[PDB]
Curated annotation (Swiss-Prot), chain B:
Limits of the Cadherin domain: 1-111
Domain notes: Three calcium ions are usually bound at the interface of each cadherin domain and rigidify the connections, imparting a strong curvature to the full-length ectodomain.
Function: A component of desmosome cell-cell junctions which are required for positive regulation of cellular adhesion. Involved in the interaction of plaque proteins and intermediate filaments mediating cell-cell adhesion. Required for proliferation and viability of embryonic stem cells in the blastocyst, thereby crucial for progression of post-implantation embryonic development.
Native source species: Homo sapiens (Human)
Protein name: Desmoglein-2
Tissue spec. comment: Expressed in undifferentiated pluripotent stem cells, expression decreases during differentiation (at protein level). Expressed in hematopoietic stem cells and circulating endothelial progenitor cells, expression decreases upon increasing cell lineage commitment (at protein level). Expressed on common myeloid progenitors, pro-myelocytes, pro-erythrocytes and B-cell linage progenitors (at protein level). Expression in mature cell types in the bone marrow and mature leukocyte populations is absent.
Complexes and interactors: Interacts with PKP2. Interacts with CTNNB1; the interaction promotes localization of CTNNB1 at cell junctions thus reducing its nuclear localization and subsequent transcription of CTNNB1/TCF-target genes.
Full-length numbering of the shown residues: 50 to 160 of 1118
Source organism, top-level taxon: Eukaryota
Localization annotation: Cell membrane; Cell junction, Desmosome; Cytoplasm
Positions glycosylated per UniProt: N63
Changes after translation: Palmitoylated by ZDHHC5 at the plasma membrane.
Record's disease association: Arrhythmogenic right ventricular dysplasia, familial, 10: A congenital heart disease characterized by infiltration of adipose and fibrous tissue into the right ventricle and loss of myocardial cells, resulting in ventricular and supraventricular arrhythmias. Cardiomyopathy, dilated, 1BB: A disorder characterized by ventricular dilation and impaired systolic function, resulting in congestive heart failure and arrhythmia. Patients are at risk of premature death.
Length: 111, 111
């Protein structure tokens, strides 16, 4: 799909599951030529790395860097999907946007 | 080191051709064949408000995304850093401030 969508709470833990993505390829099935892997080519704000992408699965996890809803209430990522054994040249490929929406927690005290 | 006054930019103009508004670079790395990866920090990059700045990890450069407004903010305060592929902060930090300059784009209001 062109856009993928996910959510997560603030003040959460590492390796906490956010959402899944997928892609497909036209070489023969069960070959290194169609063996899909994933990567974050865009994030906003780009530093630090707050998310992790299992190349095993296309599952988006958190990293050890904690999100805050009082900082940002959403994050937009772009992701790129690759195969085989060669490496990235200047010629692009099709990429897809990810959208991670933040959930509040009760870290602020009624008075 | 040298205590600096900031780079100035002005409100209400396009900054496309005024970028980059900071840049880290080192030809002592070049003479040695060394590579470096960068980070920046502070306003717009790791702290609020946001929607103002972005930075390049490969090239050391810092950009401006938008048009400034001086009745939003007079100034901004950041820190750039340089680090190697084994985690080592390679040189003294880029201590770095930006100043926002003011023109008559509003008319007075009564009390």
């Amino acid at each position: 799909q062109d856009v993928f969508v996910g959510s997560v709470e603030e003040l959460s833990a590492a390796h906490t599951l956010v959402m899944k993505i997928n892609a497909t390829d036209a070489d023969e099935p069960n070959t290194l030529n169609s063996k899909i892997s994933y990567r974050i080519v865009s994030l906003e704000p780009a530093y630090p790395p707050v998310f992790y992408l299992n190349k095993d699965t296309g599952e988006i996890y958190t990293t050890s860097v904690t999100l805050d809803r009082e900082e940002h209430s959403s994050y937009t990522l772009t992701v790129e999907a690759r195969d085989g054994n060669g490496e990235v040249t200047d010629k692009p490929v099709k990429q897809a946007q990810v959208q991670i929406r933040i959930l509040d927690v009760n870290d602020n005290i009624p008075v | 080191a040298w205590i600096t006054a900031p780079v100035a930019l002005r409100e209400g103009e396009d900054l496309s051709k005024k970028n980059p508004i900071a840049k880290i670079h080192s030809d002592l790395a070049e003479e040695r064949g060394l590579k470096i990866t960068y980070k920046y920090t502070g306003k717009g990059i790791t702290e609020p408000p946001f929607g103002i700045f972005v930075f390049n990890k490969d090239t050391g450069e810092l950009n401006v995304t938008s048009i400034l407004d001086r009745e939003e903010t007079p100034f901004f305060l950041l820190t750039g850093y340089a680090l190697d592929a084994r985690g080592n902060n390679v040189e003294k930090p880029l201590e770095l401030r930006i100043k926002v300059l003011d023109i008559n784009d509003n008319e007075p209001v009564f009390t």
